[PDB]
Amino acid sequence: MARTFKILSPTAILGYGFPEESFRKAMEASPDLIAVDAGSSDPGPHYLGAGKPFTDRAGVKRDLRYMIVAGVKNNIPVVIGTAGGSGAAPHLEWCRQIIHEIAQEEKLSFSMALIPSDVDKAIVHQALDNGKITALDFVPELTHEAIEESTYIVAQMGIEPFQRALAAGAQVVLGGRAYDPACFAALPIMQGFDEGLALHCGKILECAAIAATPGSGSDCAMGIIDDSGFTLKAFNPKRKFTETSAAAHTLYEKSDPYFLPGPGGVLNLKGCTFKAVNEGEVYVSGSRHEATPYALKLEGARRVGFRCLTIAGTRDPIMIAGIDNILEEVQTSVARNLSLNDDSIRMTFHLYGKNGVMGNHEPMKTAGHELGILLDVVAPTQDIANSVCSLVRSTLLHYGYENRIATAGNLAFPFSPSDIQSGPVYEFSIYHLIEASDALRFDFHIEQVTPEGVQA
Amino acid sequence: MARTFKILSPTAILGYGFPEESFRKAMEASPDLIAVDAGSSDPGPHYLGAGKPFTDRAGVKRDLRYMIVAGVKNNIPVVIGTAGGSGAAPHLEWCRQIIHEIAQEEKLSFSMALIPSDVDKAIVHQALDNGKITALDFVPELTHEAIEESTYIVAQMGIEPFQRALAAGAQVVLGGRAYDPACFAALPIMQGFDEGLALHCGKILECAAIAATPGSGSDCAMGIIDDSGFTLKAFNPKRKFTETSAAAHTLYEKSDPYFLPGPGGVLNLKGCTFKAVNEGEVYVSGSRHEATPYALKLEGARRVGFRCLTIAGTRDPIMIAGIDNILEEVQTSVARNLSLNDDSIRMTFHLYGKNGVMGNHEPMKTAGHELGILLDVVAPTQDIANSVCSLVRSTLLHYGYENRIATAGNLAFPFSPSDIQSGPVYEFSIYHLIEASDALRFDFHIEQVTPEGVQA
Amino acid sequence: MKQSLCSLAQVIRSKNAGPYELVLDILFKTREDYQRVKRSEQLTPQLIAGLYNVKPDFIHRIIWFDPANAVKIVMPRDIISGNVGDNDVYGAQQHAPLLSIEFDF
Amino acid sequence: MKQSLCSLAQVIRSKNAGPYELVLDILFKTREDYQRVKRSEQLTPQLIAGLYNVKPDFIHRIIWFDPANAVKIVMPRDIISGNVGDNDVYGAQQHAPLLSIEFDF
Numbered sequence A, B: 001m002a003r004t005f006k007i008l009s010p011t012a013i014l015g016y017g018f019p020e021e022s023f024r025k026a027m028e029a030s031p032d033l034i035a036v037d038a039g040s041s042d043p044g045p046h047y048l049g050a051g052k053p054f055t056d057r058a059g060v061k062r063d064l065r066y067m068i069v070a071g072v073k074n075n076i077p078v079v080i081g082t083a084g085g086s087g088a089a090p091h092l093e094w095c096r097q098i099i100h101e102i103a104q105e106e107k108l109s110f111s112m113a114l115i116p117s118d119v120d121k122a123i124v125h126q127a128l129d130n131g132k133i134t135a136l137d138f139v140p141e142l143t144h145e146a147i148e149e150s151t152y153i154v155a156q157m158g159i160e161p162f163q164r165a166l167a168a169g170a171q172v173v174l175g176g177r178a179y180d181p182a183c184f185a186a187l188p189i190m191q192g193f194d195e196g197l198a199l200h201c202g203k204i205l206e207c208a209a210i211a212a213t214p215g216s217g218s219d220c221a222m223g224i225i226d227d228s229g230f231t232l233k234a235f236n237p238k239r240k241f242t243e244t245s246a247a248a249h250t251l252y253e254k255s256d257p258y259f260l261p262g263p264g265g266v267l268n269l270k271g272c273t274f275k276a277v278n279e280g281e282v283y284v285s286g287s288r289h290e291a292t293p294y295a296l297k298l299e300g301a302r303r304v305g306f307r308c309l310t311i312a313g314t315r316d317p318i319m320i321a322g323i324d325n326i327l328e329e330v331q332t333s334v335a336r337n338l339s340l341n342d343d344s345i346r347m348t349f350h351l352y353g354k355n356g357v358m359g360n361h362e363p364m365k366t367a368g369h370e371l372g373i374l375l376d377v378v379a380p381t382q383d384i385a386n387s388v389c390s391l392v393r394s395t396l397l398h399y400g401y402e403n404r405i406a407t408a409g410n411l412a413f414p415f416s417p418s419d420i421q422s423g424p425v426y427e428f429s430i431y432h433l434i435e436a437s438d439a440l441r442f443d444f445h446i447e448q449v450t451p452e453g454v455q456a
Numbered sequence C, D: 001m002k003q004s005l006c007s008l009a010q011v012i013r014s015k016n017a018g019p020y021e022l023v024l025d026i027l028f029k030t031r032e033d034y035q036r037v038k039r040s041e042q043l044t045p046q047l048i049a050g051l052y053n054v055k056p057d058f059i060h061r062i063i064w065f066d067p068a069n070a071v072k073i074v075m076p077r078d079i080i081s082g083n084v085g086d087n088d089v090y091g092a093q094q095h096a097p098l099l100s101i102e103f104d105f
């Protein structure tokens, strides 16, 4: 547009925190927008499936207090994507209630737009039959049964819903599930700044200071968009933006750094340059955007059972050397004792210190002096998971392995009780593109937040 | 008058299981008593304090079905100590209901005695003031506050309550918290067999086949008391009793193998001998029992906070090498971000593959290629434990440690969700001797179990 | 002349690219070194597959991103993120096999 | 040459003796081996203390149980079983330092 547009990203995910001094210094730079990603699919399917946040309420409330007080005081819009960790209706309502409490504690009044991303199952069913669903790379073909057995289904919104809410005067925009760059890019684009540069800047800012070095998931970053590129900076003398740190975050979590797809188009980065500038800052230029037929990514998860787990160390070299066979013998013993004839009981062991992280892909085939043995059982009911986990635990504890000399017990439990009932287990069930339609439009609702609640 | 008394111990702890063939072969030996230990203090204070079992209901029911069917069918008494894992009122009731269900399903009728071990706080308060309480080795002095803040308080009964229930005709004796050898020794002693031999035999049998070799927490053992000693045998061709295995179980879990104290006396083992006999059996002799003024051991626990935990691996050698300082820096960051100000918020790390098992006593000072990082927070409320654990988790996930090259995240979580709320945490608060009195007498009551229940 | 990848790379890391894919990013300190590695043709699917105990065809793509002096390796995840039995829900600690790479220049 | 404890013992183990005490049991393969270890005066509180990173006076008792050719080492648990911060609630995997013992005989 003209001169610059300054975006402040306070933290990698809303709730992760940031140093107060970093945020203060960032505000002294006079941002035009305070924007933050509040959610992700990386933490796994439990959070969408169960309707729960992967972030902390107190943390989210703490971070939002800084952001909303600052935004309202200085007439700077506050824009949040994927409210509540996963951005379905319960996540959006959870974050909405936090913001109401901040307004009641700080005695603030402001307009807030809510943009839900939930998609009714009937829409997905119909789109599947009408040939409007496309699986992403390596995703199984969607079925009606998978749709029906999912819980919350959400669509990742792009810039346009945020823009409509902002154009209506919303001072805080609380979006449901959203394409991460869109939270940052929507406002500068509607003010005339370049779409390719704004979306690329949003991509690099999506995790705040993870794009700086040394990185932090809990520190502030700013992008300053001008008409030829954008400048990146942090607000902590311990951190800098470099050509490597900024380019690293262009690659972050993407399958092709040359072409970044999202709702409404693809970022083409073939012509990009990253150039160190000033002290500890980076200028990015050459990004461009290619419009595509508008489609949205759907996410969904389904419940698959219930989990009970235990954790315990072993320090005995004979047990450690023979551990793989010991665990096989323990499982056989338990199956016989409980007369287990269910193929739907799944016992999983992680042997930390040998192959707990990489499994069959671990290059080191020998453990050291100690193993942390994590056992989890997933079964169709919590009671069955508990029963199997308990019997594996007590059987392993006293199993008489060959050549054993430490004969009073085999396991060091850190906790009383030793077994932990972790509850329902979910798995991803939808990860598919859907062609955009009128039924999939994301519509905003603005409410007036006051120190005494929502006022009509 | 019988010249021998045969005791069948089916499993180390009621619920741990046993091979059906071992139990069948044991019954062919025509035991005079089926006795088993159902509980222990070793699993820690949660189970007594929260009123919960450390064994599995399905496992306990499976084990009891064999025992009660066999006892009722052969007119052999079945004696159980420390019912329900910890032997307080809820544990006794829990095991009682399991037995009622067995009687309904197996269409059995039999008399069952219930011997509660609960001790009212008022009795303990009064005994403290009257100088009747003695701390065991290394136990803190008891205070009125510690008594008042404990939950369930139990006393470990000796042989005498069991003997009174058996003399009254009870076919099944379900005792609360009890001295483990007393379960086994009560009946033979009242029948005239030597106290020392009977109690020593009970001690070796207290964990069934843990006293055999190779050991098992889940296999049967028999002791045969005669006029001059007692013989130990297993019922699995893969296991046997040896002089070492039987003597090892004399030492098991005791502070002085020469002198084993219990309610009413001390087993003096200076003159004991272990002799291999026949095939895979051991004959034990020389055990002596010396009476002492009668005192009972009290156990009690108190709630100290609430826990939330996470587990995740790291595979990066730079992170592993610097892990200790990393964790200190993460804690400092979280404390500043959440403005933490309570020394009762306790963050504990276990680094499996380095020192998770032994802590400061681990002789090896270098990790291998992988660590399992277990983090737990105990705090005055569950909400605080959850909030601190969450922020430690997300801060550690993205902490920019020195020389880091794996810059997209630091942790391999096995689960979604990553954090596991584990609930109230207890710590032992009573572990003290109390002088016997009329008020501490154990009462038994007999009920007539039928397939329809207990009438009235 | 043997030269380690570790001596040349500022970043060697893994992360998910969605629940179904694992990506490995290698970013070089200098364009000079990136180009030497790229033009050597030694960073092959066969090399990576052997390091990770997978078949060559399991490696989906190796992408040479010149503007960043970076190479990205793309593989499917053999356990979908969060599935029962997973070891690394975020895909964040799967880089270690790359640390052994040595080039011959 | 020196004789390792492992070469002489059938059982080397730890367990709680109640929530406040940790006991280490060593049962020897033969009476002759037990008597030569006892006679040697080499299995001392100073030796155990150094292996466990504790002060010698922390070792409470070393008991020579003749009927079973066994030695029991008794020390205070410095974390009561199940207390916040515990590493080993049952006290069952604390034996490893004993595995390095060699006797100069």
Ligand SMILES: Nc1ncnc2c1ncn2[C@@H]1O[C@H](COP(=O)(O)OP(=O)(O)O)[C@@H](O)[C@H]1O
Pocket: A039, A040, A041, A042, A082, A156, A178, A179, A180, A181, A206, A253, A254, A261, A262, A263, A264, A295, A296, A297, A433, C018
């Ligand atoms: N409309 C779309 N078309 C194609 N791919 C999409 C679309 N929306 C989302 N995606 C895919 O999903 C990813 C979402 O990434 P991002 O918004 O950064 O989510 P997260 O919160 O999980 O980090 C994109 O990188 C892309 O792979």
Ligand SMILES: Nc1ncnc2c1ncn2[C@@H]1O[C@H](COP(=O)(O)OP(=O)(O)O)[C@@H](O)[C@H]1O
Pocket: B039, B040, B041, B042, B082, B156, B178, B179, B180, B181, B206, B253, B254, B261, B262, B263, B264, B295, B296, B297, B433, D018
């Ligand atoms: N009346 C008592 N006098 C002295 N010590 C006792 C008394 N009752 C119990 N103890 C102590 O408590 C221990 C309990 O052991 P045991 O009955 O086998 O319990 P567990 O069920 O925990 O294995 C005894 O070995 C002894 O140290």
Ligand SMILES: [Cl-]
Pocket: B381, B382, B383, B384
């Ligand atoms: Cl709470």
Ligand SMILES: [Mg+2]
Pocket: A037, A038, A039, A040, A041, A082, A180
């Ligand atoms: Mg996101």
Ligand SMILES: [Mg+2]
Pocket: A180, A206, A253
């Ligand atoms: Mg993202």
Ligand SMILES: [Mg+2]
Pocket: B037, B038, B039, B040, B041, B082, B180
């Ligand atoms: Mg017991």
Ligand SMILES: [Mg+2]
Pocket: B180, B206, B253
């Ligand atoms: Mg016992």
